[PDB]
Amino acid sequence: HMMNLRPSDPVGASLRHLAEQVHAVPIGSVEVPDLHISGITLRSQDARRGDLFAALAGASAHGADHAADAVARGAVAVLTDSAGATRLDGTVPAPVLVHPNPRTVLGELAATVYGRPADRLRVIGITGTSGKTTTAYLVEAGLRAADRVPGLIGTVGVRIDGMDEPSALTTPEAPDLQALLAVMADRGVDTVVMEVSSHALSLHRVDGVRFAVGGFTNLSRDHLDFHPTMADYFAAKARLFDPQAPTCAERSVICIDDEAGRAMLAGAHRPVSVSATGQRADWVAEDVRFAGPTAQDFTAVDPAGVRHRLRVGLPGRFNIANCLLAVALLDAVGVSPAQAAPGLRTATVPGRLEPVDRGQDFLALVDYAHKPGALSAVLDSLRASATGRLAVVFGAGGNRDPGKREEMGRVAAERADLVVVTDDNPRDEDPAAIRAAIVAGAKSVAGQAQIVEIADRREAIDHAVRWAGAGDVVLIAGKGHESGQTRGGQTRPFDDRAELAAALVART
Ligand SMILES: Nc1ncnc2c1ncn2[C@@H]1O[C@H](COP(=O)(O)OP(=O)(O)O)[C@@H](O)[C@H]1O
Ligand SMILES: N[C@H](CCC[C@H](N)C(=O)O)C(=O)O
Ligand SMILES: [Mg+2]
Ligand SMILES: [Mg+2]
Ligand SMILES: [Mg+2]
Numbered sequence: 001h002m003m004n005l006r007p008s009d010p011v012g013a014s015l016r017h018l019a020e021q022v023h024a025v026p027i028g029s030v031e032v033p034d035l036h037i038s039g040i041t042l043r044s045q046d047a048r049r050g051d052l053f054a055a056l057a058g059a060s061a062h063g064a065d066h067a068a069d070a071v072a073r074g075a076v077a078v079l080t081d082s083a084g085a086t087r088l089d090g091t092v093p094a095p096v097l098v099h100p101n102p103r104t105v106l107g108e109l110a111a112t113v114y115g116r117p118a119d120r121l122r123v124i125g126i127t128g129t130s131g132k133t134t135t136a137y138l139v140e141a142g143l144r145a146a147d148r149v150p151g152l153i154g155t156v157g158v159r160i161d162g163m164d165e166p167s168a169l170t171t172p173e174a175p176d177l178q179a180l181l182a183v184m185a186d187r188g189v190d191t192v193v194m195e196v197s198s199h200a201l202s203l204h205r206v207d208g209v210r211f212a213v214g215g216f217t218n219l220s221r222d223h224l225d226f227h228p229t230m231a232d233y234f235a236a237k238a239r240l241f242d243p244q245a246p247t248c249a250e251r252s253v254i255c256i257d258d259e260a261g262r263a264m265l266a267g268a269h270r271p272v273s274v275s276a277t278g279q280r281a282d283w284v285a286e287d288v289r290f291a292g293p294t295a296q297d298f299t300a301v302d303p304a305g306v307r308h309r310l311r312v313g314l315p316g317r318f319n320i321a322n323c324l325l326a327v328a329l330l331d332a333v334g335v336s337p338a339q340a341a342p343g344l345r346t347a348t349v350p351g352r353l354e355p356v357d358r359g360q361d362f363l364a365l366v367d368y369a370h371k372p373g374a375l376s377a378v379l380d381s382l383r384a385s386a387t388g389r390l391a392v393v394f395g396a397g398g399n400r401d402p403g404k405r406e407e408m409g410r411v412a413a414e415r416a417d418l419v420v421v422t423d424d425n426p427r428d429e430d431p432a433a434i435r436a437a438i439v440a441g442a443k444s445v446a447g448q449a450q451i452v453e454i455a456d457r458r459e460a461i462d463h464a465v466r467w468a469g470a471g472d473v474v475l476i477a478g479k480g481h482e483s484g485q486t487r488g489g490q491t492r493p494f495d496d497r498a499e500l501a502a503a504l505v506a507r508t
Contacts, residue, residue: 004046005167007182011115012038015052015077018112019097022105027085027096035076035095040110040175049074052113054106054175055084064088079109107174107207117181118210121151121189122333125196125206125249127237128217130374131322132195134314134352135217138326139193141347142340146330151184153177153194156350156481160187174207181209191333198223198236206247213332214240214249215325219260220373225401234260241268253328255321256281272303274328276321283328285320290386293363294355295345296320300327300337308337311345315363316353316381351480353378356497358504361470362388366496368480370397370424372407375477379415388471389417391464394478395424395457396434398486405434409441413449416475418467421453422460424478425486431455457485458499465503476500 015035019025026032038050044066047053053070055063055078064084071078071094078096080088085098099105111118124139126132136154143150144162152159158168158180168180184192196214200206219234227233239245241252241264252268255261257277265271275281282303289297294315300308300323312323323344330340348354355365369375375394382390392412396405412419421438423431435453442451454460464474476496483495 002167003048004041004043004169004176004179005165005183006039006179007114007117007186010038010113010182012036012050013112015095015097018052018109021112022099022109024079024097024099024102024105027080027089027098030095032097033095037077037113039179040106040113041070042106042173042175044070044073047071047073047075049076051075052077052079052109054078054102055080055088056102057081057083062087068092103204104207107178107204107209109208110175110178111208114178114182117178117185118208120185121181122191122212123181123209124191124193124213124215124329124333125209125211125240126193126215126217126325126329127196127198127201127240128215128255129220129222130377131217131318131325132197133368134319134322134349135215135326135329136193136195137349137352138312138323138344138347139329141343142326142330142335143191143193143333143343145341145343146335146339148335149188149190151181151189151192153180153192155195160184160189172205174205177206178208193329196240198233199226201239201247202227202236209247211240211247211249213251213253213329215329216241216252216254216261216264217322217325218255218258220258222371222373234263238264238267241271243269251332253325253332255325257321272328272332274321274325276324283324285324288320290384293386298323300324302331302337308341310337310341313345313347314349314353315355315365316378317384318377318381319353351482351497353381354497356500356504358501358508360468360504360508362468362472362474364465364468364474364476364500364504366476366480366500368478368482370394370478371401372404372411375408376411376415378475378477379412382473382475383415386471387473388469390415390473390475391418391420391467392416392475392477393420393422393457393460393464394476395422395426396438396478397425398427398429398431398434400427402437405437406441406444409438409443410445413442413445413447413451416449418450418452418464420460420464421451422457423455423485424457425484427486428488431487457494458503461496461499462503462507465500465507
């Protein structure tokens with residue numbers, strides 16, 4: 001029954017001032033009161049003394065049906081839409097405001113209520129198809145090494161001043177994010193690094209955030225079950241860099257190693273370009289050197305002409321680009337490469353090319369990639385002379401884009417020496433039919449990959465671990481930091497890191 005995290009003593013705001021700020025109007029004939037509002041939420045179970053409850057239309061349900069409960073829990077006022085109003089007329093003992101489309105103003109209302117936390121610290125937002133999480137963790141580690149106090153908001157969770165924050169949401173709505181930024185400022189955070197997804201930029205979830213710096217990794221095909229076309233997907237991410245958009249960051253740090261990045265740079269507010277593929281850019285990586293199985297040395301060249309010799313403590317060639325972007329973002333908030341370097345060398349990223357070491361003589365790691373494009377990239381990222389043979393173990397989710405299954409098999413069989421097709425959250429589907437589609441795609445490739453099908457994921461991990469010899473690479477893909485195997489409405493624990501470690505201890 002743990003309610004969502006709020007700042008302990010927010011400045012708050014008068015309801016009348018909030019109504020004037022966003023052109024909300026009273027539901028009825030009574031003028032908006034100067035009632036003190038100390039919080040805002042869209043979830044009645046998170047409502048508490050002093051809150052404005054946002055009662056909004058949603059999936060086959062309207063929050064107005066929960067407004068009486070929110071007020072009973074201590075909310076002192078309600079903000080709703082026209083539909084909600086007709087349903088709240090004279091039913092709750094609290095003032096009600098109506099707005100044409102409240103979802104579009106919740107972020108700015110929460111910014112006011114929580115004291116404009118994005119003006120108390122520097123917010124870095126990072127968007128792009130892949131690399132948001134790794135880049136964010138590298139930035140957080142660089143800030144800590146520089147003796148700054150960082151906050152991190154990402155897919156895995158939230159961390160504040162070096163401490164996990166389990167009471168915060170990983171995918172906050174706009175009011176939740178403002179509350180979390182205020183908590184961070186209260187706890188001494190001077191710089192927040194957060195992932196900003198195309199969903200968030202399309203659904204008003206980062207409205208009201210002043211972004212000091214925006215970063216762009218790359219774009220490839222993804223999220224087309226939400227965006228109608230690639231052009232809509234690009235346009236959503238462009239909202240972080242377009243000077244005409246209210247979400248535009250004050251400085252844009254853009255990787256130009258793909259077509260989308262080059263186009264983003266051309267229209268971006270106050271652009272800084274970054275390239276780890278040899279192209280001309282303000283920041284470039286050069287002189288990349290092998291540094292053992294889980295580290296890579298490189299030189300970051302800054303726009304002033306200074307060469308910084310650095311180490312990123314991650315495997316995978318594309319992590320040079322993520323580290324270079326992290327370095328440029330850190331510079332944009334006043335952290336030098338030398339100050340950040342100890343953090344870049346030691347950072348760990350949960351579920352993103354995350355190695356597990358139990359003393360074996362080969363590289364064994366877990367990665368989140370669960371779609372063909374990301375899987376192709378991570379397999380390519382692990383291709384290098386040091387890499388003997390490469391094995392990948394994965395499956396595909398039930399009740400998730402079935403059209404990707406053959407393609408995942410294809411991309412794996414084009415790149416890996418051993419492809420182990422197993423189960424990964426078959427959910428309400430026939431698990432054997434999912435594996436069959438992946439296997440068919442893998443077999444359609446002309447090459448020399450060995451294709452093995454093992455339904456049980458523990459057995460599949462075990463098979464790959466037993467197969468590996470000195471200098472080989474074993475990749476367990478598709479779950480990353482996410483624990484669980486869901487079948488027919490039941491979920492059993494299954495953490496790929498724990499299961500990989502157990503196989504390594506047993507077999508190695
Ligand atoms: N710069 C990159 N280019 C291509 N693929 C990447 C990059 N960074 C990470 N990946 C891969 O894509 C997936 C998502 O990586 P992550 O670092 O979580 O990105 P995001 O947070 O943008 O989803 C992982 O499975 C990883 O293998
Ligand atoms: N958590 C995300 C990714 C899961 C990826 C893969 N493990 C799967 O279950 O399809 C989801 O629910 O779509
Ligand atoms: Mg995504
Ligand atoms: Mg992510
Ligand atoms: Mg957690």
